């Protein structure tokens, strides 16, 4: 498979998941109907999303990993998809949840060629190959912010903290898409507890560091040796190469 | 003024200022064009949206106080705009981002009788009048919930919180729609600066207060005596009959 092959399925899963979803009302879609292979309830839109996004997928041959179905397919390349980050603004008709398609030539992240994350309530397209990230056919890169005093997303504020501005918007995929164009300076999972899932960031990492950013744990150690597996969890610290230090330093 | 005029002509000042807005690409969107008479810059989509409103609003017999021109009119009938709060979303294509108005048969919250919202992205149109609280038609209402592990929208999260989840969309007038609607249980700005201002809190205490919502400032004051001008300062403890108590004490 090819980084443009990626982007030719991840668009049509894309079509596919937002319309299930577009026609699906908001009753229908908060009730809860199963429990994922994630060990959490699976929500009446998890259900259509992951069927439209695994028609297709499971259609081509990789080893795609997702929370309601856990590890499918023997595939040579693996595929971190969620169909649908950010149920619960969904369920609200709150519009920030996407489909997030990552797509590696190897288990770990390291071998990552391609990122893709598209928001199924505005249609925005956020991916990045091997030739740049971009937000719907246009180019993005990150922000020239360099000092704290920066407007940050954080997961989540405990204390004073010198930033322009926080916001937590319920989509770390999207979140991780707002820092990637220069809208947010820095994204910032510190949960200590470790609550971020493969499938959860694998992509919006991609496309941020595509973008030139510094995307890594709270140690500042590389994220590439991440496993496509449903175990597989992590912290995040995402801003420009001249801003990470500070909040590294700052939260530290 | 009646109800039924104030719901005509605020949908009409949501049309132009959607039509305004949706023209202007991010790039000029998030140009300082200059000063804002309430202090702070002027973005070319704050001159537009606010443009294109008092161009609606100032042939009516009422007073006006906003946040670019400030106070303007000669009526008895105080109005509350806001013509586009979430500039920052605005201008970074993040779509939570509303004109918001309240009309009053005085300077003061109490008399309020018309409360709209309008997420200026989405179309979403909140409002209140006698007959209750409507999103997109339809009437809506605070939740239910009664314990202090809910979903809470929090200006801000300056410490250890019990809540289930924390969000901030960086638009109270329409996040007081996520509480009115419910879509979130509640809704607290406790900045320990009274930072929020008039035509922030207006459209949303009322529309909120209308759906159930019991809404006060950070003591529990009641807020009828808010007055609509330049200078009152909010802070704002929304949550359903029993949850609120339980936040009153909380953060105290
Ligand atoms: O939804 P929570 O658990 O309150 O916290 C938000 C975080 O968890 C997630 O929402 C999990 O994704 P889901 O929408 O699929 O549940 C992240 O996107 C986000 O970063
Ligand atoms: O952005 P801050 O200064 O951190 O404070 C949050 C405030 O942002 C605001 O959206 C500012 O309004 P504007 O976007 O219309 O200027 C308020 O609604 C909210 O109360
Ligand atoms: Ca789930
Ligand atoms: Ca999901
Ligand atoms: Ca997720
Ligand atoms: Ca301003
Ligand atoms: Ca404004
Ligand atoms: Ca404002």
Do not use: W
Not at 135 to 151: F, H, K, P, T
Not at 156 to 172: E, L, Q, T
Request: a negative charge.
């Amino acid at each position: 498979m090819d980084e443009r092959d990626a982007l030719r399925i991840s668009r049509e899963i894309a079509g596919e998941v937002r319309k299930a979803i577009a026609s699906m009302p908001l009753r229908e879609r908060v009730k809860d109907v199963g429990m994922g292979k994630d060990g959490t309830p699976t929500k009446a839109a998890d259900r259509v999303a992951e069927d439209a996004a695994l028609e297709i997928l499971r259609k081509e041959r990789v080893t795609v990993v997702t929370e309601e179905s856990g590890v499918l397919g023997e595939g040579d390349v693996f595929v971190a998809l969620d169909p649908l980050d950010g149920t619960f603004n969904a369920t609200r008709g709150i519009p920030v949840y996407s489909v997030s398609l990552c797509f590696s030539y190897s288990d770990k992240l390291k071998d990552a060629f391609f990122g893709y994350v598209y928001n199924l309530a505005t249609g925005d397209e956020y991916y990045a190959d091997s030739s740049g990230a971009y937000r719907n056919g246009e180019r993005i890169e990150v922000s020239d912010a360099e000092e704290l005093y920066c407007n940050a997303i954080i997961y989540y504020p405990d204390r004073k903290f010198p930033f322009k501005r926080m916001r937590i918007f319920g989509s770390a995929a999207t979140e991780l898409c707002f820092f990637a164009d220069g809208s947010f300076d820095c994204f910032l999972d510190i949960r200590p507890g470790k609550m971020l899932r493969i499938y959860d960031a694998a992509a919006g990492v991609f496309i941020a560091e595509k973008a030139g950013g510094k995307v890594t744990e709270l140690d500042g150690e590389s994220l590439g040796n991440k496993k496509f597996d449903m175990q597989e969890r992590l912290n995040i610290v995402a801003a420009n190469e001249k801003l990470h230090p500070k909040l590294l330093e700052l939260i530290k």
